[PDB]
Structure 1
Amino acid sequence: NIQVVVRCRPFNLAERKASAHSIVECDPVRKEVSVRTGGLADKSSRKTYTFDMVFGASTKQIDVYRSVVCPILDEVIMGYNCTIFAYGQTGTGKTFTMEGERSPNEEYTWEEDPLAGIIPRTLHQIFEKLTDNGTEFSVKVSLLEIYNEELFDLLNPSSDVSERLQMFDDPRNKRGVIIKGLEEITVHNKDEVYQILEKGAAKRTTAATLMNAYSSRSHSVFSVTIHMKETTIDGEELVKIGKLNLVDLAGSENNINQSLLTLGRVITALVERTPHVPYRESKLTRILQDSLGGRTRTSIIATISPASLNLEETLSTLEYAHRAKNILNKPE
């Protein structure tokens, strides 16, 4: 089965000032999320769901990274392909989890910032893990985004954001795709990481000015490819190639998002064991086909809100994530 975990965000200043009370309780021991759905103080109804891990509102980024990402990175380094999705309502912390933010007032360098998310920590950690173990390696990254079923490259320095890319089937791979023109940027060392991310964020701002509600309607796929070579005591070369996809999905909230609709239908087909799985009906599912019932090791981080206002979308996210637990992949 694929791994599914839930992370609740903390209340913001607005909500605190209103003296909001959380409707979500996370029990990491029981690995349970419980949501208050109705009823007064002294008596209530709840809905409860069990996941692979649960992370309550006070969970820090480093603890998400250690619990979830560390083991996945180790499998990437062994030469497996892995994907982590963030799924949930706009405003629940998909981008916070996958990217993170900067601590205010230049308190930290990027490497040491506690608010850093999965992407920067991962890139930083690859260089640390492979520092002097006998494995020669290179790291390449791309950042592809999908908005209104069009493809954009958020790292090509010499293309304007608005040039769409074209996708084709990869002839040497049944079910693989080729994305014509997608830039892969070589990351030569840890000191090259930040400015690469910065250039991405700058292209994203241009995108947002151009395309309506870009940040909530777009899907983004940040790919890290690690090409590895070991030499044995007899001078034989051993090759390993690991790929990690870190995906920040469109907001799940209730205009037409074909890729998000098709993801849900792919999940349904897989869990119901329907023989036709509709991968080909969107760009997102064609690109990530191998992550959904394929040979990639997959995790989903489902993000939720503590706030009573968000009750129905929270329940929808939890039901969707709980169903996805039944997806079966066959890694390597």
Structure 2
Amino acid sequence: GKNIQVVVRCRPFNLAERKASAHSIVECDPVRKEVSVRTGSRKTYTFDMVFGASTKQIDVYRSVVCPILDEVIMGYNCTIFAYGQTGTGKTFTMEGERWEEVPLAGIIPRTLHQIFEKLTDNGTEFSVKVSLLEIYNEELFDLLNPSSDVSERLQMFDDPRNKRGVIIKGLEEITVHNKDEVYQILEKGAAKRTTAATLMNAYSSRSHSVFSVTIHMKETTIDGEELVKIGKLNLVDLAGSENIGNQSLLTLGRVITALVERTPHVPYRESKLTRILQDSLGGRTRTSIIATISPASLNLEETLSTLEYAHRAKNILNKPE
């Protein structure tokens, strides 16, 4: 439990689902923190939080991200994952759509927005840098490198200074000079993802996208302390859930269950994704998974697998009704 929170966000019905007379098979209870699926009876699950279909972008940021970002600012490493079937709002949650953050903008812009705000406001001295890479078929593609050819992919090495840490050789890290750059950066990176799909067949719903902001901080108070700090926040938009049956999800899972159940050897090195994230992941870092689901019976089968998966990663006991 503790460091690791797991929450389910359910999206609204889409046009397709309506048009097909699809039935809402999912009950979301925010307050009892329970999801239920009608299979007729019902299977009920419990999570640290549950977000019904009416929840706005800000509600998510506020109850999920804020605690974590406080911790990153404190100079730690965190990860927020979005897991679930394609079309259930992973990206929507993680990025969003087009001064204050447009109500449709998701976690990544808000995160960037907030970072500047707080550090400017407390007069901390800091520099922000972001990087974006996707993992397709256990192979790393840098989405921010303006130069490289599409077939170019990055290799990682062990970090001599850090037993948990890793070195991605060649990875572009762009410097961010204000809260608005994020967008055009997210745009560079979308141009490239496209390209990799057209030319390499690495389709975005079939791969993991890892967006990583690293904050260098120096805080100073006369008669106080001089703190030197580096926080880092990896915001991970996972490959579509339906690809199980691909195996990086199973490992990601095996690693979260281990972390939560506290078993002797957490298998980080058995997948690229968890290898890379191994530096968040574990001691005293908030880690969070947002599982996305559809309400409709059209998608029932996948909705279930997602919830089995969330359930398996952090197994909470159903409280008496």
Q: What is the TM-score normalised by the length of structure 2?
A: 0.91
Q: Where in structure 1 do 4 or more consecutive aligned residues deviate above 6 Å?
A: 327-332
Cα deviation, residue 29, structure 1: 1.0
Instruction: Tell me, in whole angstroms, the C-alpha distance in 1 between the residues paired with 2:319 and 2:165.
Output: 16
Q: Is the 8 A contact 2:196 2:202 kept in 1?
A: no
Distance 2:127 2:225 in 1: 19
> Is contact 2:22-2:298 (8 Å) kept?
no
Tell me whether 321-330 or 83-92 shows the greater mean CA deviation: 321-330
Moved more, 29-38 or 282-291: 282-291
| Alpha-carbon contact 2:254-2:313 (below 8 Å) kept | no
Query: 1:56 and 1:331 mapped to 2: Cα distance?
Result: 21
Q: Note if contact 1:271-1:323 (Cα within 8 Å) is conserved in structure 2.
A: no
Deviation by residue 1:235-272 (Cα, 9 ceiling, x = unmatched) = 96321211001001111215873422322333454456
Q: What is the CA distance between 1:72 and its match in structure 2?
A: 1.5
Using a 3 Å threshold, how does the CA distance of structure 1 residues 186 and 255 change in structure 2: closer, same or farther? same
Residue 191 of structure 1 is matched in structure 2 by 180
8 A Cα contact 1:295 1:331, kept in partner: no
TM-superposed deviation, 1:331 = 31
Report the more deviating stretch, 257-266 or 121-130: 257-266
Residue by residue, what CA displacement relative to the aligned partner does 1:268-315 show, whole Å, maximum 9, x if unpaired? 544565433322121111111233334432000011111112222212
State yes or no: 1:243 paired with 2:232. yes
Distance in 2, matches of 1:164 and 1:67, equals 36
Deviation at 1:82, TM superposition (A): 1.1
d(CA) in 1 for partners of 2:252, 2:303: 18
Pair 1:327–1:164, CA change in 2 (3 A): farther
Residues 268 and 30 (structure 1), Cα distance of their counterparts in 2 relative to 1, 3 Å cut: closer
Q: Distance in 1 between matches of 2:73 and 2:264?
A: 33
The equivalent residue for 1:137 is 126
Which position in structure 1 is the counterpart of 2:7?
Answer: 5
In the alignment, the residues of structure 2 paired with residue 18 and residue 124 of structure 1 have an alpha-carbon distance, to the nearest angstrom, of 40
How many angstroms apart in 1 are the aligned matches of 2:231 and 2:131?
Answer: 14
Are the structure 2 counterparts of residues 174 and 329 from structure 1 closer, same or farther at C-alpha, using a change threshold of 3 Å? farther
Distance across 1 between alignment mates of 2:317 and 2:154: 31
Once structures 1 and 2 are overlaid, which stretch shifts more, 222-231 or 284-293? 284-293
Give the C-alpha shift of residue 126 in structure 1.
1.1
- Matches of 1:198 and 1:254, distance apart in 2: 26
Equivalent position of 2:36 in the other structure:
34
* Distance in 1 (alpha carbons) for counterparts of 2:282 and 2:171: 25
Change (3 A) 1:72 1:320: same
Is the CA contact (8 Å cut-off) linking 2:7 and 2:47 kept in structure 1?
yes
Question: Which moves more between the two structures, 165-174 or 313-322?
Answer: 313-322
Q: Aligned to 1:29, what secondary structure does the other structure show?
A: coil
Ranges in structure 2 where 5+ consecutive residues have no aligned partner: none
The answer to whether the Cα contact below 8 Å between 2:17 and 2:298 also exists between their aligned partners in 1 is: no
Is the partner of 2:204 in helix, strand or coil?
helix
* Alpha-carbon distance between aligned partners in 1 of 2:63 and 2:258, rounded to the nearest angstrom: 29
**Aligned equivalents of 1:166 and 1:152: distance in 2?**
10
Identity of aligned residues (%): 99
CA distance in 1, matches of 2:198, 2:300: 31
Displacement after TM superposition at 1:80 (Å): 1.8
Deviation at 1:38, TM superposition (A): 1.6
Report the alpha carbon displacement of residue 199 of structure 1 after superposing the two structures with TM: 0.8
- For structure 1, the residue ranges without an aligned partner over 5 or more in a row are 40-45, 103-109
Distance 1:227 1:257, change over 3 A: same
The residue that corresponds to 2:68 in the other structure is 72
- Which residue in the other structure is 1:85 paired with? 81
Deviates more, 1:225-234 or 1:271-280: 271-280
CA RMSD of superposed structures (Å): 4.0
Counterparts of 1:156-305 in structure 2 under 5 Å?
156-212=145-201, 214-234=203-223, 237-254=226-243, 257-270=246-259, 273-305=262-294
The farther-off stretch of 9-18 and 197-206 is 9-18
- Counterparts in 2 of 1:70 and 1:34: CA distance versus 1, 3 Å: same
Q: Distance in 2 between matches of 1:213 and 1:240?
A: 37
Distance in 2, matches of 1:129 and 1:331, equals: 42
CA distance in 2, matches of 1:251, 1:88: 6
